[PDB]
Amino acid sequence: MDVFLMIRRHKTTIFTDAKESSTVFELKRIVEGILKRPPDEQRLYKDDQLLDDGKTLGECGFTSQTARPQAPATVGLAFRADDTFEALCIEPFSSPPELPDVMK
Amino acid sequence: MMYVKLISSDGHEFIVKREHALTSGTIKAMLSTNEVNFREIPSHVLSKVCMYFTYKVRYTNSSTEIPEFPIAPEIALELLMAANFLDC
Amino acid sequence: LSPNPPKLTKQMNAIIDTVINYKDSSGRQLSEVFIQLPSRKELPEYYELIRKPVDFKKIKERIRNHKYRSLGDLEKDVMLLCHNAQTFNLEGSQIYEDSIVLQSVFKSARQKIAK
Amino acid sequence: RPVLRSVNSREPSQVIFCNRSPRVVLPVWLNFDGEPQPYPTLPPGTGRRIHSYRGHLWLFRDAGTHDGLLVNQTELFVPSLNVDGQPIFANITLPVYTLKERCLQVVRSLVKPENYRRLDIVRSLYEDLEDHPNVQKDLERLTQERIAH
Ligand SMILES: Cc1ncsc1-c1ccc(CNC(=O)[C@@H]2C[C@@H](O)CN2C(=O)[C@@H](NC(=O)C2(F)CC2)C(C)(C)C)c(OCCc2ccc(CN3CCN(c4cc(-c5ccccc5O)nnc4N)CC3)cc2)c1
Numbered sequence: 477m478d479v480f481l482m483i484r485r486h487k488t489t490i491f492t493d494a495k496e497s498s499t500v501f502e503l504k505r506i507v508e509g510i511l512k513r514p515p516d517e518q519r520l521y522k523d524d525q526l527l528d529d530g531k532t533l534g535e536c537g538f539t540s541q542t543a544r545p546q547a548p549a550t551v552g553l554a555f556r557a558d559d560t561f562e563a564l565c566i567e568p569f570s571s572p573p574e575l576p577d578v579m580k
Numbered sequence: 581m582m583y584v585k586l587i588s589s590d591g592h593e594f595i596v597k598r599e600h601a602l603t604s605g606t607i608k609a610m611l612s613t614n615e616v617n618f619r620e621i622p623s624h625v626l627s628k629v630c631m632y633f634t635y636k637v638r639y640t641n642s643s644t645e646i647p648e649f650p651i652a653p654e655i656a657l658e659l660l661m662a663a664n665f666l667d668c
Numbered sequence: 669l670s671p672n673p674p675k676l677t678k679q680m681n682a683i684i685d686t687v688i689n690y691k692d693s694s695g696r697q698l699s700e701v702f703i704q705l706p707s708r709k710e711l712p713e714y715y716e717l718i719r720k721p722v723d724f725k726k727i728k729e730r731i732r733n734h735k736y737r738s739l740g741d742l743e744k745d746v747m748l749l750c751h752n753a754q755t756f757n758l759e760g761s762q763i764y765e766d767s768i769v770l771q772s773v774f775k776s777a778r779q780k781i782a783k
Numbered sequence: 784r785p786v787l788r789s790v791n792s793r794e795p796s797q798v799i800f801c802n803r804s805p806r807v808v809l810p811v812w813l814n815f816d817g818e819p820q821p822y823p824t825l826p827p828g829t830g831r832r833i834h835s836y837r838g839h840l841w842l843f844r845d846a847g848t849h850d851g852l853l854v855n856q857t858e859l860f861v862p863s864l865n866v867d868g869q870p871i872f873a874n875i876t877l878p879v880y881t882l883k884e885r886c887l888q889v890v891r892s893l894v895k896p897e898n899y900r901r902l903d904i905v906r907s908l909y910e911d912l913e914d915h916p917n918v919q920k921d922l923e924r925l926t927q928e929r930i931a932h
Pocket residue numbers: 701702703704705706711713722723724749752753754756757758763791793794800810812822823824825831833834835836839
């Protein structure tokens with residue numbers, strides 16, 4: 477029933493949870509509470525694909541098998557600036573060092 | 581619904597529910613204010629820490645069988661140091 | 669002190685080897701656990717409850733040394749072993765069930781060897 | 784006779800051991816002197832109907848590392864008498880480990896005990912890595928908790 481997500485934009489990551497039954501619009505409403513941008517200033521994505529407001533999270537492909545507490549599914553986020561949405565841009569996390577010789 | 585922001589050494593911002601961040605004894609102490617900067621914890625480690633917070637809250641005292649918390653060998657040492665510093 | 673006739677010793681051994689070698693439908697040798705008793709140091713609770721302890725090792729030794737004077741004497745020690753295993757472990761245990769199959773195996777081998 | 788041990792009840796009890804963890808499970812039986820006895824292991828996702836007795840005490844560990852496991856959401860399992868035949872269920876699972884303990888498990892699984900002090904980490908963590916999961920330590924911890932209550 478529950479889906480666990482990372483809503484990412486540039487250097488920002490929101491860790492949140494929702495139901496498989498909740499809509500993409502309800503998710504935009506969670507973001508609005510946190511980042512103070514209304515849903516109409518938001519574009520949500522799954523693997524560079526635009527998510528429709530009326531669709532449930534389950535219908536988008538976010539399930540208890542793909543969106544886990546220990547391994548959350550990533551949702552992309554693009555904001556609207558001067559009536560134009562920016563290109564979807566997600567900054568990668570830092571890279572770990574090369575595995576030590578004793579760990580091989 | 582209270583949220584807190586956790587900033588990594590490389591400037592990534594992680595927004596987690598307050599109750600989930602209180603899993604860490606160090607964070608709980610620093611919030612005893614809803615923003616904490618970690619000048620020595622990189623984003624690839626901090627994101628993994630936030631995933632532990634979700635895992636812990638969801639599975640502590642659950643009746644649904646508990647999955648393993650997975651850790652890649654390449655992040656194991658830095659993740660150990662952060663868990664030790666964060667008291668979680 | 670005088671030994672048993674060789675025919676009687678041969679009969680006693682042929683029966684006991686049929687009991688010891690017996691395997692169920694799954695290929696499991698049922699006598700396995702009953703070959704040797706655990707020691708008093710290992711399982712003192714067995715010795716607290718079981719007055720006349722015996723295993724298939726002490727049984728084979730008793731044939732070899734002519735302690736059993738008839739097939740009936742051999743039977744009393746095999747039934748004793750199984751009843752000891754039943755009393756200690758109680759109903760619902762696999763060892764209890766295995767000891768009941770071995771009782772039946774002994775009596776059928778003794779009937780076959782004496783025909 | 785210690786606090787944590789089995790009672791020689793001689794009262795039969797049918798139990799189902801069910802490994803619902805991703806680990807190979809070591810069932811551990813505490814004898815009549817409270818000494819731990821290793822029992823045949825259970826591969827992940829397997830169940831066996833076993834015979835035990837009323838008032839007998841069980842613990843469950845990872846067979847290879849001896850990391851502690853849960854049984855019906857607790858540490859110790861004691862079967863009571865079966866009510867009208869009914870076997871008693873023992874559902875074995877992973878606990879929620881601390882992030883530190885889980886990190887220690889992973890680093891111990893990759894590095895040999897001799898090379899722990901060759902790791903580029905906070906020096907306090909060497910003693911943490913050396914302090915391996917131990918059944919006896921946990922039994923002392925559980926006994927101390929029992930006397931406290
Ligand atoms: C499959 C599987 N997968 C995962 S776990 C598992 C599994 C689970 C259960 C068992 C068998 N059950 C038990 O051992 C239960 C459990 C606990 O309550 C204690 N206990 C008992 O029987 C004790 N009994 C008692 O408290 C009482 F009987 C007094 C009531 C005890 C230990 C015998 C004192 C098993 O078994 C297979 C593995 C397993 C377990 C234990 C042992 C060591 N044995 C101990 C003594 N034993 C015996 C020999 C003879 C005997 C010998 C010669 C001649 C005549 C005889 O009657 N008689 N009875 C014995 N129990 C041989 C070696 C070996 C193998 C495997």
